[PDB]
Design a protein around this ligand. Structure first.
Ligand SMILES: *[C@@H]1O[C@H](CO)[C@@H](O[C@@H]2O[C@H](CO)[C@@H](O)[C@H](O)[C@H]2NC(C)=O)[C@H](O)[C@H]1NC(C)=O
Ligand SMILES: *[C@@H]1O[C@H](CO)[C@@H](O)[C@H](O)[C@H]1NC(C)=O
Ligand SMILES: *[C@@H]1O[C@H](CO)[C@@H](O)[C@H](O)[C@H]1NC(C)=O
Ligand SMILES: *[C@@H]1O[C@H](CO)[C@@H](O)[C@H](O)[C@H]1NC(C)=O
Lengths: 98, 49, 147, 73, 49
């Protein structure tokens, strides 16, 4: 999971690796993203795109227009709007629930 | 490098002003305050000294 | 601000410095309009015709050696900074000192100043975090950057 | 630029993502305190547009997507 | 909000004004507490009687 955000001349990102097992939909539960990087940038960006890995093999035709067997992949995009969250903080400090 | 920004061959005009982001370094403001070769050094929310 | 009359005086003259005359709406704070177009007012749209009541975006200057001091060019630099958001590396000139523990003493950490005892803290901090706070939103813990 | 052929056009699949991607709003650490911060968040039970990059026939799609403040991927 | 921070970054005359503002704001806060406390104290006093 990642949350890309642009605020006050800073580009920011947040991440978590979850070892969820066998759920097609996003897992029921609570996990909290931890900021990974902060970059100070002025770029204004209207839209974004994703990068795929083409799984090129011997069985494929052998060209850049038709030669590919990419297979399975899945990704979900959700927008972010200003909202107020009451965030519970645990003794350690992990946000256990919100 | 506050000095390099202060002395430059070309300064961008008001329509497309030049902006530089300075960070990850140590700047001494005494020379700027100390030098006093500048006509106006107005300061808001920060004491120059 | 500070004058550079000598640099702005040329025999040929200088006119690469321009300021906008007209714009439909007010420019936003800390933003620059990079768009190149001629301001248009109401009817009789110019579409680049730039005759009467339609004006080109650019406007030059008049800096000349002969020209008076009062309207002579000034070189202006604006310094803007925001503080107490993240660990700050824009720190000034000062040196530093060895940490002191279990004794009431004044302390400053990366431009943060607090009047209390400093002791080794049991609380475990995750990599991103740089400050700790209590219920009353007062400083409770800090990390010496060097240490 | 190089292209790709035989793509399948279908309406976007939808799912409901609930209480996901809550991100530590800032740098402070607090213990056993409930805090309210007015920081952009994915709305709970917000609608989520699923996407597919799987051939399973002749299916491959990775087109441009609109971006607002909430670019949660 | 922090009192020390205000004093550290402001010259005395300006610092004077901001200090006063804080005190007025802080004086009012204290007044409310003491005034509130008295009413509660009186209420508790009645119960004790
Ligand atoms: C930019 O201009 C400033 C101001 O003239 C220069 O600062 C002076 O540099 C000389 C030579 O190093 C010193 O002897 C002076 O004490 C400095 N102050 C002044 C007011 O002259 C600076 O060297 C120039 N160049 C930069 C920063 O690149
Ligand atoms: C950002 O880019 C969009 C492109 O549609 C443009 O309309 C808008 O004016 C730009 N805003 C800024 C602040 O650059
Ligand atoms: C939280 O702290 C307790 C201390 O008993 C520890 O057992 C537990 O592993 C910690 N969990 C996390 C997520 O830090
Ligand atoms: C999500 O989109 C689907 C489209 O089928 C719609 O039925 C549903 O009402 C939407 N829910 C929300 C919360 O937008």
């Amino acid at each position: 999971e990642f949350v890309f955000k642009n605020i006050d001349g800073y580009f920011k990102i947040y991440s978590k690796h979850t070892p969820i097992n066998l759920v097609r939909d996003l897992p029921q539960g609570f996990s909290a993203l931890e900021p990974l990087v902060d970059l100070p940038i002025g770029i204004n960006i209207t839209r974004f795109q994703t990068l795929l890995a083409l799984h090129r093999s011997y069985l494929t035709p052998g060209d850049s227009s038709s030669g590919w067997t990419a297979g399975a992949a899945a990704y979900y995009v959700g927008y972010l709007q200003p909202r107020t969250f009451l965030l519970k903080y645990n003794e350690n400090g992990t946000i256990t629930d919100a | 490098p506050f000095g390099e920004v202060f002395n430059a061959t070309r300064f961008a005009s008001v329509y497309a002003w030049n902006r530089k982001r300075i960070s990850n370094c140590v700047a001494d403001y005494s020379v700027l305050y100390n030098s006093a070769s500048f006509s106006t050094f107005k300061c808001y929310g920060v004491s120059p000294t | 601000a500070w004058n550079s009359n000598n640099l702005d005086s040329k025999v040929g003259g200088n006119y690469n410095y321009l300021y906008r005359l007209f714009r439909k709406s007010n420019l936003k704070p800390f933003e620059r309009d990079i768009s190149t177009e001629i301001y248009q007012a109401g009817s009789t749209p110019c579409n680049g015709v730039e005759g009467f009541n339609c004006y080109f975006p650019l406007q030059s200057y008049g800096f000349q050696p002969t020209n008076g001091v009062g309207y002579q060019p000034y070189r202006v630099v604006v310094l803007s900074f925001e503080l107490l958001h993240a660990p700050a590396t824009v720190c000034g000139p000062k040196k530093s000192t060895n940490l002191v523990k279990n004794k009431c003493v004044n302390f400053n950490f990366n431009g943060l100043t607090g009047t209390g005892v400093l002791t080794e803290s049991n609380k475990k901090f995750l990599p991103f975090q740089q400050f700790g706070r209590d219920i009353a939103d007062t400083t409770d813990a800090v990390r010496d950057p060097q240490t | 630029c190089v292209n790709l052929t035989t793509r399948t056009q279908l309406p976007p699949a939808y799912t409901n993502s609930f209480t996901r991607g809550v991100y530590y709003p800032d740098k402070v650490f607090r213990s056993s305190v409930l805090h309210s911060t007015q920081d952009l968040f994915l709305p709970f039970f917000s609608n989520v547009t699923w996407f597919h990059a799987i051939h399973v026939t002749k299916r491959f799609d990775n087109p441009v997507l609109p971006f607002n403040d909430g670019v949660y991927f | 909000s922090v009192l020390n921070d205000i004093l550290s970054r402001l010259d005395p005359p300006e610092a004077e004004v901001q200090i006063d503002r804080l005190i007025t704001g802080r004086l009012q806060s204290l007044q409310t507490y003491v005034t509130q406390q008295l009413i509660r104290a009186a209420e508790i006093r009645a119960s004790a009687n």
